[PDB]
Amino acid sequence: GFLQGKKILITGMISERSIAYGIAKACREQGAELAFTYVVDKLEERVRKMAAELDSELVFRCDVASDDEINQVFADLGKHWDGLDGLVHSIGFAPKEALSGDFLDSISREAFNTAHEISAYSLPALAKAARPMMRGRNSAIVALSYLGAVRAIPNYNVMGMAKASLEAGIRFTAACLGKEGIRCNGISAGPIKTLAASGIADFGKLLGHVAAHNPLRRNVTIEEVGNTAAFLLSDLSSGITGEITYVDGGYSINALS
Amino acid sequence: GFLQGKKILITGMISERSIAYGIAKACREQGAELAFTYVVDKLEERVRKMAAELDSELVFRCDVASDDEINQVFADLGKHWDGLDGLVHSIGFAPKEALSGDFLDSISREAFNTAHEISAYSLPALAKAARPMMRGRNSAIVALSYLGAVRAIPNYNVMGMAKASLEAGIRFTAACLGKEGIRCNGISAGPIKTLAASGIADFGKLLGHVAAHNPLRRNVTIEEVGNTAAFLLSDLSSGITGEITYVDGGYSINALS
Amino acid sequence: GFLQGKKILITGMISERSIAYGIAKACREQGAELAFTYVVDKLEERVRKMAAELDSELVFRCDVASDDEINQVFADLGKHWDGLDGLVHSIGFAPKEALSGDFLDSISREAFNTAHEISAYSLPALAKAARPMMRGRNSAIVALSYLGAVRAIPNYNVMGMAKASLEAGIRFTAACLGKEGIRCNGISAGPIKTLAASGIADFGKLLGHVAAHNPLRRNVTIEEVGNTAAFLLSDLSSGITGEITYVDGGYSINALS
Amino acid sequence: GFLQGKKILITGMISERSIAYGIAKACREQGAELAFTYVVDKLEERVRKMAAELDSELVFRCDVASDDEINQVFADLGKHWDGLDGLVHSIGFAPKEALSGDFLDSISREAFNTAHEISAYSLPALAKAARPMMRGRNSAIVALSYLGAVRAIPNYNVMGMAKASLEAGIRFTAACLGKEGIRCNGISAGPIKTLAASGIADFGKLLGHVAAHNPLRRNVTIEEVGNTAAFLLSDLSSGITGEITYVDGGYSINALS
Ligand SMILES: NC(=O)c1ccc[n+]([C@@H]2O[C@H](COP(=O)([O-])OP(=O)(O)OC[C@H]3O[C@@H](n4cnc5c(N)ncnc54)[C@H](O)[C@@H]3O)[C@@H](O)[C@H]2O)c1
Ligand SMILES: NC(=O)c1ccc[n+]([C@@H]2O[C@H](COP(=O)([O-])OP(=O)(O)OC[C@H]3O[C@@H](n4cnc5c(N)ncnc54)[C@H](O)[C@@H]3O)[C@@H](O)[C@H]2O)c1
Ligand SMILES: NC(=O)c1ccc[n+]([C@@H]2O[C@H](COP(=O)([O-])OP(=O)(O)OC[C@H]3O[C@@H](n4cnc5c(N)ncnc54)[C@H](O)[C@@H]3O)[C@@H](O)[C@H]2O)c1
Ligand SMILES: NC(=O)c1ccc[n+]([C@@H]2O[C@H](COP(=O)([O-])OP(=O)(O)OC[C@H]3O[C@@H](n4cnc5c(N)ncnc54)[C@H](O)[C@@H]3O)[C@@H](O)[C@H]2O)c1
Ligand SMILES: Oc1cc(Cl)ccc1Oc1ccc(Cl)cc1Cl
Ligand SMILES: Oc1cc(Cl)ccc1Oc1ccc(Cl)cc1Cl
Numbered sequence A, B, C, D: 001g002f003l004q005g006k007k008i009l010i011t012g013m014i015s016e017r018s019i020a021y022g023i024a025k026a027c028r029e030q031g032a033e034l035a036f037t038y039v040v041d042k043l044e045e046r047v048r049k050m051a052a053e054l055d056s057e058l059v060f061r062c063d064v065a066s067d068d069e070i071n072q073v074f075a076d077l078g079k080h081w082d083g084l085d086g087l088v089h090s091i092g093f094a095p096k097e098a099l100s101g102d103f104l105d106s107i108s109r110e111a112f113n114t115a116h117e118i119s120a121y122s123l124p125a126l127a128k129a130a131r132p133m134m135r136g137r138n139s140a141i142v143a144l145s146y147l148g149a150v151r152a153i154p155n156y157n158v159m160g161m162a163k164a165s166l167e168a169g170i171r172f173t174a175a176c177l178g179k180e181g182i183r184c185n186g187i188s189a190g191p192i193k194t195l196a197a198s199g200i201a202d203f204g205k206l207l208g209h210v211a212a213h214n215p216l217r218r219n220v221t222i223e224e225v226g227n228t229a230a231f232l233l234s235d236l237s238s239g240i241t242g243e244i245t246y247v248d249g250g251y252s253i254n255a256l257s
């Protein structure tokens, strides 16, 4: 197992459809020891149960809107773990009304701020809070992004701006932390039916177009995303930092198919 | 000239060193009629005086932190102009402390929020507010970005995340408005000594490195940026939308020089 | 006219549908003086006639397969002109059989070599031969490329590899010549029905998909490409080198529309 | 390991410094069965000896200048293996004189043709020749590229054009073969002292600049490149095709460091 001895904190696992669940399962299959966060109290039981199936009893509340909660996660986790080898950012949010229809009609200052704070700022915020536990460990951060960072896409709207901010965040974090032995990389995943995906108007059509038009002629799975994250969290990828890797069956590199 | 009679609103002109001044002068040279905004009352006289030299008496206060002020500009401008042919976004802000030293140490939630709101959200906010005046005119929007959008750069820090958000904003705005006959493009300018540039720690060294390492072996001018904006505002560029054009003397495409 | 006093050599003009014709017409409208090349003797009369309508009697044979013919163009042109301010590369070739159907089935060593030699090597070959006439003149080179450089596209096949080589050629030429006052830029044009376009199997479908899916919801014109080339050949673009500018109505920056 | 029983053909292994050696060792560590090619008879013994240390007695001559030799490899290999799961392209060549000094002065038609034929065409040529043995196996191809594909770099010169062609080749091969269950990906490696590296004028300074300026503040190893190739050859990367992955310690995403 190529993550033997790695201790990895995973955000964003709320169901077995979650990308973070695929990541968790892939990492555990490679021998990682896991810990998890959940955004609100209502989810605690569900997440503890999934964590238990993945051999973990380390679960912490963390709304990334809160610097106090972010910092408290690492304080609490630090009582159990000497250091942190892996950090998975698999979280995003924007108000549903901002992800439907005309980009300018649907945008607002408040939706823009929320989308960026939760979807983009949270990466440097978590990296910063994790830094004492991660530095010097030859450790790694993986964050999830989407093609909307670099292409205009119907309905994704302000989340595209937030993902672009996130990808730049990945690059700046990588440049910041590389000398102290922390890597930071992104996965730009193709569409996958998850709980959050239903917030994007006409998600079913995005999903269908990609399967019809990508080189693989099918959509990717949370196992495929998960195995890629596991690689990027492992010492196998020690030469790679500041990279965005596309796990979309080649969709982004194809045109007019 | 190739903007003869075109009516263009320009943000961000605060001195004769401003990129927006170079844009203004370039547009006026091609026959455009201009109007201007200024962030606070303390600048009104200075901006009115520059505007007068460019044959304009149309000057409006606009802090892009304020949706009221943004929308009031177009209400007031609309008393003079029956439509708007061009809109120039040449504005940015982040707290100076966030643009000095280690990326994660210098970042904060509040600095992130400010940087994104003023530097990135302001593009769709202005596009949205201008839309009734611009649509159906084969009109155009130009916004100013920087390499920090797509590369990690020392000291630019959180402004890089904001510029990435901005460039995605340009793409989404272009996709949104293209059917209505409004284009939206970006210029990624090389470093230029402007008032805002002094907010970046060690800007003088950044400026020097580019001149020593780009294909042209010199920095670009506000006239060069300005002429590019004039082109992108004109019907000559009617086949171009959602584009980021580098006016950095080739710096971005060079390595190891 | 922003090309007043500019002397520009244009390759590739074989009919009034040619991209090079749109370039020629756009440049002449801005006051440029023109000269032209043609690949074989059979075309001489047709090209001389088009050149005459554009106020030029300077027409030279040039098969870019031949170093002797390339060099002879500048020797001959140098009898009339003191220097050369603009050079337009608007030429490409690959055997038709290599641009139909399965990429690997259709490729061959010989087709690959031809495609690259004529479509890609010709840019540095012409730049190199033109260099004595262009250096120190604040002059400029523009070459035409296509999205196949950076995306896989059905049927374009080995021409995509040649266009990628070309775009790198543009970057290396820009880096090479920038200090001596020669710029080199590319235009990646959207699909346009030209003589050469019929060599691509199912070109009509490419053309239709782009018009249905790009931000402008229409294809671009040779006037739009031409006006962009005119800008890139003019002193207005003096801050820009090594750049690929997309004149495809935003097609490349849109996805899933 | 994650390549257990997978049969992988590796080109380009000429010494223990070779990138292909790092790939070979990484694949063998994950359980792969290997076979190898060598360019000329003079190398046969050296390569057989390295192959033996990696538990292989399958070694074949292959100068990729020769379509006969390329196709003969798979005919001969096919006597031992009923199919092929992995193919590694780790080969390049250009005349040394073309990789020294001014790009245009050093280039020639013949050097361009050689560089592209050996460095770029060889990827689709090998993919094409391997296709009967690879299809239907959920198999994979990996090829090695360099930053010169997408940035101008001193002295790398015409090899940059060839690498750009190669990367497009990777994209087109991926699009071509995806339905048949063959993936094709690239690794853009940072500088590593190998035999071929000495062909680049002033390679030692290039190597030094990267270590001084990348996020990791060091150069990558053939083990790091190798482990990445092993991942891209394995079913773990089944969601990834047509991708270029940077294993350069973040060099490409950094600027002005
Ligand atoms: N599903 C896809 O097609 C897809 C494609 C590309 C990228 N992504 C990205 O993958 C990541 C995971 O999304 P997913 O599709 O697995 O959806 P998901 O709904 O399974 O997970 C989204 C997670 O974000 C968390 N979250 C939201 N607001 C939060 C806050 N304030 N604090 C902490 N956590 C918060 C949610 O609780 C949830 O666990 C996201 O970044 C998403 O943008 C998804
Ligand atoms: N100077 C450079 O090297 C350079 C390079 C690339 C991009 N840019 C970008 O060019 C644009 C113009 O900056 P410049 O360098 O000409 O500097 P400048 O200081 O002349 O202009 C910056 C402008 O931003 C305006 N601004 C700041 N906060 C504002 C607010 N809340 N509301 C409205 N306006 C506000 C300022 O009043 C000022 O007019 C910016 O987007 C900057 O990021 C500059
Ligand atoms: N039409 C399009 O949709 C489109 C889109 C993007 C890029 N381009 C590019 O635009 C450029 C011009 O093509 P076009 O579409 O106007 O077609 P065109 O047929 O009008 O021009 C192609 C030209 O290439 C010339 N040529 C071919 N082999 C030559 C040789 N050995 N020596 C000298 N000249 C030679 C032809 O004689 C012809 O003049 C090409 O580089 C093409 O790849 C075209
Ligand atoms: N070393 C680096 O810094 C570096 C960085 C990025 C990419 N690369 C690429 O990695 C690959 C491997 O090179 P390396 O650096 O390991 O050097 P190397 O010298 O160990 O390997 C180069 C190989 O190319 C083979 N080759 C050359 N001409 C050939 C022909 N006609 N037919 C068949 N094989 C031929 C050589 O025999 C040799 O085995 C190349 O594609 C190179 O461009 C190298
Ligand atoms: O980023 C995503 C991209 C896709 Cl294709 C599908 C789901 C995604 O994830 C989200 C989408 C919308 C919201 Cl409000 C929150 C999240 Cl996490
Ligand atoms: O974005 C920029 C990039 C450069 Cl190289 C120089 C100046 C720039 O403009 C700014 C820099 C810092 C702040 Cl706080 C505000 C602005 Cl407008």
Ligand SMILES: Oc1cc(Cl)ccc1Oc1ccc(Cl)cc1Cl
Pocket: C091, C092, C093, C094, C095, C096, C099, C145, C146, C159, C190, C191, C192, C194, C196, C197, C199, C200, C206
């Ligand atoms: O590059 C092109 C791209 C497009 Cl969409 C249309 C035409 C193009 O130009 C060519 C296509 C094929 C051949 Cl054989 C030669 C040339 Cl010049």
Ligand SMILES: Oc1cc(Cl)ccc1Oc1ccc(Cl)cc1Cl
Pocket: D091, D092, D093, D094, D095, D096, D099, D145, D146, D159, D190, D191, D192, D194, D196, D197, D199, D200
């Ligand atoms: O592509 C490369 C890039 C780097 Cl930084 C180092 C070595 C490389 O490999 C080569 C360099 C020159 C020649 Cl002639 C052949 C090969 Cl294989």
